[PDB]
Amino acid sequence: KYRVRKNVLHLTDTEKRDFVRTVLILKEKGIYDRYIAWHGAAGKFHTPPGSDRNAAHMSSAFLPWHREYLLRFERDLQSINPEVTLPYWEWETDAQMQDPSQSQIWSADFMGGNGNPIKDFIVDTGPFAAGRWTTIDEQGNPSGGLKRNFGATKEAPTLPTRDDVLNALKITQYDTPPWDMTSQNSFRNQLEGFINGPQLHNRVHRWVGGQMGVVPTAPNDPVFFLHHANVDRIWAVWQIIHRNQNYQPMKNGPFGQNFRDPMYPWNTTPEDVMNHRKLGYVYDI
Amino acid sequence: KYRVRKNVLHLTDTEKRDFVRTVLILKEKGIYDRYIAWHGAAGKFHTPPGSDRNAAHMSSAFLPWHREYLLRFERDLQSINPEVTLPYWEWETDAQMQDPSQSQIWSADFMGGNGNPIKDFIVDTGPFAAGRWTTIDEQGNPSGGLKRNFGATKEAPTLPTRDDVLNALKITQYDTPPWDMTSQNSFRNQLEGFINGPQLHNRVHRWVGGQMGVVPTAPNDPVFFLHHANVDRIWAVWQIIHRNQNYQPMKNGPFGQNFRDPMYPWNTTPEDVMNHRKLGYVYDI
Ligand SMILES: [Cl-]
Ligand SMILES: [Cl-]
Ligand SMILES: [Cl-]
Ligand SMILES: [Cl-]
Ligand SMILES: [Cl-]
Ligand SMILES: [Cl-]
Ligand SMILES: [Cu+2]
Ligand SMILES: [Cu+2]
Ligand SMILES: [Cu+2]
Ligand SMILES: [Cu+2]
Ligand SMILES: [Zn+2]
Ligand SMILES: [Zn+2]
Ligand SMILES: [Zn+2]
Ligand SMILES: [Zn+2]
Ligand SMILES: [Zn+2]
Ligand SMILES: [Zn+2]
Numbered sequence: 001k002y003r004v005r006k007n008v009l010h011l012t013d014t015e016k017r018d019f020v021r022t023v024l025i026l027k028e029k030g031i032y033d034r035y036i037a038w039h040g041a042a043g044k045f046h047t048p049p050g051s052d053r054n055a056a057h058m059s060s061a062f063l064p065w066h067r068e069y070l071l072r073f074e075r076d077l078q079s080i081n082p083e084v085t086l087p088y089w090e091w092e093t094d095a096q097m098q099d100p101s102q103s104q105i106w107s108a109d110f111m112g113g114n115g116n117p118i119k120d121f122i123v124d125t126g127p128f129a130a131g132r133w134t135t136i137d138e139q140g141n142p143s144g145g146l147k148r149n150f151g152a153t154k155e156a157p158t159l160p161t162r163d164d165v166l167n168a169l170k171i172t173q174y175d176t177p178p179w180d181m182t183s184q185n186s187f188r189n190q191l192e193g194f195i196n197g198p199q200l201h202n203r204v205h206r207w208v209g210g211q212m213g214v215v216p217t218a219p220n221d222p223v224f225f226l227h228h229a230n231v232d233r234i235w236a237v238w239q240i241i242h243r244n245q246n247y248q249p250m251k252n253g254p255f256g257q258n259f260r261d262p263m264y265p266w267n268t269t270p271e272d273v274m275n276h277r278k279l280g281y282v283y284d285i
Numbered sequence: 286k287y288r289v290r291k292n293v294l295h296l297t298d299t300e301k302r303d304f305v306r307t308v309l310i311l312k313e314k315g316i317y318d319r320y321i322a323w324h325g326a327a328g329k330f331h332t333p334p335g336s337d338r339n340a341a342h343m344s345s346a347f348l349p350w351h352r353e354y355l356l357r358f359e360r361d362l363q364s365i366n367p368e369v370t371l372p373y374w375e376w377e378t379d380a381q382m383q384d385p386s387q388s389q390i391w392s393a394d395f396m397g398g399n400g401n402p403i404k405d406f407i408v409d410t411g412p413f414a415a416g417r418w419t420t421i422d423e424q425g426n427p428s429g430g431l432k433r434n435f436g437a438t439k440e441a442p443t444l445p446t447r448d449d450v451l452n453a454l455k456i457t458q459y460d461t462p463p464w465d466m467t468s469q470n471s472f473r474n475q476l477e478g479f480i481n482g483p484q485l486h487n488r489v490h491r492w493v494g495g496q497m498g499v500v501p502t503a504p505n506d507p508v509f510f511l512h513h514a515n516v517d518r519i520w521a522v523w524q525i526i527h528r529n530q531n532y533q534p535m536k537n538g539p540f541g542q543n544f545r546d547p548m549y550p551w552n553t554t555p556e557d558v559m560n561h562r563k564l565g566y567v568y569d570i
């Protein structure tokens with residue numbers, strides 16, 4: 001309840017600079033890659049085997065898994081710079097802009113811009129531009145650099161709206177059986193974005209494009225964390241609005257999917273991360 | 286110093302029954318799969334990216350990474366039955382047999398026998414025969430059943446010998462740069478099996494065949510843990526013989542390979558598991 005996570009639009013130029021520096025430091029030491037890999041491994045970890053669900057997506061653990069992911073990542077930033085916390089990208093607000101690509105989050109001072117079509121959409125601007133930031137493929141081998149292609153697909157030509165967020169917050173049930181891509185009247189599946197997909201969470205990944213548009217490579221793009229800090233914020237809000245409500249399933253959904261089950265690749269359980277304040281952080285506002 | 290890890294050949298009928306029983310429960314609960322996944326993930330995690338070294342093999346962390354692996358595995362077994370510890374398969378003595386496939390380790394009440402040529406070398410005997418034990422391919426999808434083909438390979442027709450172990454124990458250095466498959470006069474690379482490969486550990490893997498023969502699927506076979514328990518034991522012996530020799534590299538090795546670096550997929554470091562006695566276990570003898 002001490003660490004404050006801020007809206008990207010509220011950061012001082014120094015905070016932006018420090019965040020970028022710390023990320024680049026984590027990347028140099030080899031710590032950043034551990035994060036890419038954890039998310040990759042989890043994505044291929046089906047619960048149960050053969051099922052469409054995995055440890056981090058298309059199921060109940062989607063939200064708590066990423067919260068732990070972000071928590072661990074933020075603790076790593078703190079180790080380098082104690083004054084650095086994870087900021088959140090409020091995409092619902094950027095969706096209101098005439099041209100979202102002009103949002104300050106994409107400035108050459110922060111995340112860098114959209115991909116360059118003349119270069120097969122390689123990001124050639126910002127601190128994570130090809131040549132300054134190496135990426136790796138799902139195979140785990142060096143790739144050719146970050147790629148982004150804002151709103152190119154037909155299913156995600158735009159960022160989700162404030163209304164989409166509001167409608168999701170309306171759901172009274174955290175999740176509902178079978179606890180997967182098909183769960184109905186489920187806040188979790190709603191936020192994740194499988195209802196009339198792609199929506200919200202899923203839609204943002206698709207809108208961004210490049211490595212961000214697919215599970216095995218998503219974290220190669222630093223914005224992955226700003227996105228999920230926002231997703232984590234929507235959830236924190238949901239938890240306040242419906243305080244009558246608790247995580248689901250409690251038992252008898254799939255192993256690694258239940259309230260007290262370990263979340264591959266960690267021993268962390270959903271219960272362990274239900275209270276973000278106990279985890280040591282809050283969102284401005 | 287309380288948990289004793291025993292030679293498979295020193296186990297009672299009951300101790301073997303309980304070990305197998307506990308492994309099945311671990312499997313049934315979904316815990317066993319986490320281990321197959323962890324080992325697979327580590328094998329694809331190169332240190333550094335593009336390199337030939339990975340978090341669990343072909344470099345210095347090979348030994349401490351597997352020691353941590355077994356420790357975690359033994360703790361889970363202990364959680365199911367506090368009287369069960371990890372036994373070790375002393376293959377160097379089995380190598381002396383006229384026909385090693387006749388060793389009591391392969392009895393039907395234990396691990397099971399060799400694969401069935403008619404079935405495409407699917408294991409049809411023992412507690413883990415196809416139909417009684419599910420397996421998972423490199424993709425994380427169900428694979429249809431355990432396979433074994435003892436010494437079918439021209440490269441590893443025989444199990445390593447006592448002489449092979451003894452010679453490795455004479456090595457003075459834990460490891461040597463470049464800290465990878467080419468390291469010379471390295472106890473680690475020797476025990477792993479790359480000096481005139483396939484030797485030792487690498488040779489046991491190749492000799493067993495089936496999922497045990499390849500990195501991404503090896504742990505699917507329970508004997509993987511019995512194998513690595515002996516490898517761990519051989520290392521523990523080396524540690525006592527060369528009491529003034531320590532882990533290498535101490536620093537400036539690839540991140541993930543140094544004495545105090547975290548070992549993907551965990552935060553555990555080689556330092557953390559250098560003394561097995563501190564880990565709560567010892568070998569019988
Ligand atoms: Cl603020
Ligand atoms: Cl909140
Ligand atoms: Cl909250
Ligand atoms: Cl504020
Ligand atoms: Cl004994
Ligand atoms: Cl003994
Ligand atoms: Cu993802
Ligand atoms: Cu995501
Ligand atoms: Cu091995
Ligand atoms: Cu291995
Ligand atoms: Zn809150
Ligand atoms: Zn944690
Ligand atoms: Zn603010
Ligand atoms: Zn590879
Ligand atoms: Zn010892
Ligand atoms: Zn010595």
Ligand SMILES: [Zn+2]
Nearest residue numbers: 291292295569
């Ligand atoms: Zn004994």
